[model samples]
Target: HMQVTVETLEGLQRRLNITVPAANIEDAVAAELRNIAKNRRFDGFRKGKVPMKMVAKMYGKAVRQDVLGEVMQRHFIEAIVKEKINPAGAPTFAPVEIGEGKDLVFTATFEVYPEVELKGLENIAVEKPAADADVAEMLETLRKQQATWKEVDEAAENGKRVSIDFVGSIDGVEFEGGKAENFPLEMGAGRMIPGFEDGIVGKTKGMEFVIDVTFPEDYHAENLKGKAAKFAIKVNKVEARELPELNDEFVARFGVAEGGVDALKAEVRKNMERELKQAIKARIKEQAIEGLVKENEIQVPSALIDQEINVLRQQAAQRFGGNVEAAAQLPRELFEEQAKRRVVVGLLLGEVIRTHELKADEEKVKALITEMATAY
Candidate 1:
């Protein structure tokens, strides 16, 4: 058995300070020395027969580090389990102060997981929409899916696709990742910046125009916050969409049996209803989790939050094919907000799982993996 103690202190900048036991360090070191001696080579002794005093003299410092590290790891795990601590990230071990014939003294300071109390699911109320897909809605969606593009010489209009080349500038200087060539955008599609579609409205093919827009004050890019940017755009082509007539050809295209329009509509409606049901279920699950979080008040560690923020930034950067170092230059507050949300959700979910004794079914997970692997 090993002896250990813990200390909480504020470092130079309000950081946490933790301490561990000395006897634990001694035991770890002694165990490691025995193992080493079992396989070690010495000039004056056979393997597995080295003197303890000689081993300690020759490799005392290294052995002490190994022992202290092991003791810290084991004690940290024990402490977390003993205290029901759910740490969000790995803990950092601080330097140990050693003295002649004195006990080994060290501290570990890092983030601990938030303590959460989960509210029962029965206490939460949620509304789920009925899984009914209207015939008109399905028809409209099918028409859009089968629509064909046709280039026209007339002026651009709503529901028409406009092909253009654009360059965006901020504060009279062009910024990176703000330039595009031959970009296609449908009018009133809410895909481009606000006021951009209005600027392109009524413009004919081969027309050149400058669309001015201001980035939001709370935009992710700090340098572009509330900054006016101009997109120098030239419309190259205007294409109107033409959907196929709802008939046998359309029904056959959908791979439906009997090749009838009614058959296709029925199939589409059934699929839509299934999709809506799944969507409603997901929304209710989110609401239930949110309700539990609101009921539980817990303190999260800054170190863990910082680490999670770093990971979030990396994931965001990867989505846009960028590197983490370049992504880190964005606004820190935005990243922190994302990190805090993740930590809160994680803590709440973990508490719910523990309180309910919910264990993930391996068979279900394996089936899901198999389904994904075989999906076309």
Candidate 2:
């Protein structure tokens, strides 16, 4: 017989401690060693004739570990069934307190799936619109890609690129590495510092002017944030885009199978429909999970959420380099809520699969991969 005790810590982690009688463990290890001796090969000793004392002396530590693991796994399953504990994640085994001729004692820690009450699916309804790529839209998209830029004599405007030389000064002092010569910037594009684009507007070629700009309060450059800066700028040239007309030549650019606009339109429509279907499925899944979480009010472990947040923060920092603290300063409650919802949904889905005794079909997965590769 084994004794098991379970407890919840701060409503976040579940801890389980188990103790098995020392005699039981010793008996099991002796039986396993006897079986090993029957089959094991050793020099200067016939199989099944090896001295038990020598065998125990040579493999005592390994035997103890093996016996303890077997006992823990067997009793843990029984304990889970008896206690009706639904674990959310794999339990981590803590170091066991082992001693000669003493009971086997160990602890495990993990998160458990909260009791969930489903709601609101019957009342929820969503409309998924079919995506259609019209000829006009496709033509416009193609024209934009085929557009040509022409130098203009007028001042810079929206959708036009301007070549300029500029020097930026912060707090009445020109900063080092804050100047550029023959720099090209597009108007209405938020490329430069705030107010820089607006100031460049209405400035024609060869015009030298001074403009006032302010850095954002949360700007990365610490010394310049919220500080007013002066830019001495000279506009060199202005270029405006001109789109080509739609014709057979334009249709040929697509390289459609039939080399016709109708074929291209059909292909585009098919692709758009597939994309729309995926988008609708994702939206529906999200709504379903939201409804489930709202009704169930599932509690998730803070440890798990913290782990996920750390991974997400690392990924975000890798993509957009920044201090982890700066990234963490943003609202986190929404992220925690999302993580909880994910855990609840996963648990429910797993339960549903288990109830139905469903097994994943590897053949179907391979078929899906083949289908996607063909589509590409």
Candidate 3:
């Protein structure tokens, strides 16, 4: 026989004190022992014919362990079902004492899902970014994308691509990864270290100069952290960028063969408008979620929060391609706020949907998909 008593430990947490009669567990263990006696094998013993005393003495602990596990699982489900208890997450079971004639006793601690009440239906505030895109800025960006480079015979300066040969050394001694030939570096792009690119600037063709710089304290390599290094740079060539003229040729490259610059500009404007719409929608969604969370006070289950944390942790590991050490180094508390926020939003939205019996309209869903698919 199984007996269950439920108690509220705190706001959402619950404890189930369950007990099983001795005969129930003992009978189950004995039945399993009988099955083991029939087929379980041992050295220097006849198969299916070993004495019950010998079998009990040798396999008793293992059999009892397996039988007790099965008994707990089966009766736990039966008790919860018989009592109509809906658990939000997997219950953590405490240790149980099982003996030949004593009753088995244990406790399962878990949390129940909250009964969310819908509130604050009308007072949501949303902040949206600028819906207008700068056409001149957009065209400037396009011109930069279409920029070409032409070799120069004079001094190199900002925005110029410089080809150079260099050898870097630490402590006046050359180290590994300290040398390269004909490395192309773009000035002012942060491609090279601070001062490395700046040092290369205002220099001309065939000029050789030595530039000294210090690595940052948090540098990746152990030996190079905060270390001073000198580079022997030989300027091989310099090239200045040239932007393409807005013409029919340029428009054709963008798959627009008819309207030339006007058509291209129109396409750019349309794209920016699409992005603006999405940005506005995202802003509104954020405000709605924030408002929903603020409207009502709901006690979130610790179990659900833990589940979200684990899901985020697993996702982080996958993002790093199974780099367990990197993932483990990330603090659990770092994910706590993010997990709690998401869980709160999810529970809030679920309550709203359930209370209103809300369902997505097929026409609007199709329209939404169309809005997204065309942008790609």
Candidate 4:
């Protein structure tokens, strides 16, 4: 018989003080020494012919320590089972004693799985989702993506693209990256500093003028922030964007031959429907998870969170490049918040499944995968 005592510590921590009978340790160590003597070699004795007493005298100390470890583990498992304790992570063993003809004593410290009640689930209300596919918006987006530009003879205006040469100077001196030749600028695109594109709006082709503008306080260049600069601008050419007409040629460009615009619209409608379904499903799932997390709050074990942090760290490392050293060097704080949330969610889901006896429907999962795969 083994003496076992359970102690509760703070925040899901548990400690088991166990004492194994002296006879068990002595028997295990003696048996292991004899097993080793069967195959051990010595100078006077041939291989597998070493005497038991000689082997015990030489290797008994090491064998006893090894046997103690195995015996402690075996008893720990038996104690946890007998006590019905579910450990969240691996236990750390602290040895108290291992002397000749003395009872083996030790303590196993670990975190136990939280007693989850799976409450407040009924309060999580998920809204039903509906999908509305808009084919016209999709067609307009496609047309804009394929728009062509034509040279215009009039003055530059908003929605027009212009080619120009400009030299900018600060404090009466030109700075680095302050000049460009024949650079194309799209008016209203906001690609340049404030007032730069607007300064050229009314200017016509072949016109030359100087416009002064101030850089924003938060400009990326340290020396240029909040500085006023004058640009000597010359407009070379102005062009206006034109969307392609819906015709046989446009349809053929998109690989929809024979049926023309009607077939193209049908294809766009189908793709949009698939996207709408997926988007709606995603939104609904987000709502459910958010509601559940808000309602069922539990103190997650730190051990589980640490395990999740490693997973998140490896995932982040894989995203940039799978460098093992980089993953190891990543700080725990980078993933701690997310890891805690994920661990809580995992525990809740496991409890939900256990209490409800829910099983995954394989056929439904396969069908859903097949539906999603069609989008590719």
User: How many collisions per candidate?
Assistant: 1, 0, 0, 0
Off by over 4 Å in 2: 1-139, 247-249, 252-376
TM-score (C-alpha) between model 4 and the true structure: 0.35
- Give the alpha carbon lDDT tens digit for every residue of 77-185 in model 4: 6676567564555678899987889999999898765543222322222111211123344455456645778898978888888988888888778866687777667
**Stretches of model 1 off by over 4 angstroms after superposition:** 1-139, 247-366, 369-376
Clashing pairs in 2: none
Residue 152 lDDT in candidate 2: 83
Better structure of 2 and 3 per TM-score: 2
Candidate 1 collision pairs? 87-113
Cα distance off (Å), candidate 2, residue 182: 2.4
Give Cα-based local distance difference scores for all models.
0.55, 0.59, 0.59, 0.63
Write the candidate numbers in order of decreasing lDDT: 4, 3, 2, 1
Tell me how far the alpha carbon of residue 224 in candidate 2 is from the true structure, in angstroms, after superposition: 0.6
On residues 213-319, what C-alpha lDDT tens digit does candidate 1 reach at each position? 77666655657667777888899899998887876555464453463446555454344333333433443533422101122122233444555566655654554
**Which of the predicted structures, 3 or 4, would earn the higher lDDT when compared with the native?**
4
Full candidate order by TM-score, most accurate first: 1, 2, 4, 3
Estimate the TM-score of every prediction: 0.36, 0.36, 0.34, 0.35
Q: Local error of candidate 4 at 139, Å?
A: 1.7
Instruction: Determine which window of 10 residues in candidate 1 has minimal summed lDDT.
Output: 288-297
21-71 per-residue lDDT for model 3 (tens digits): 888877877887778778768887776577878878877888777877766
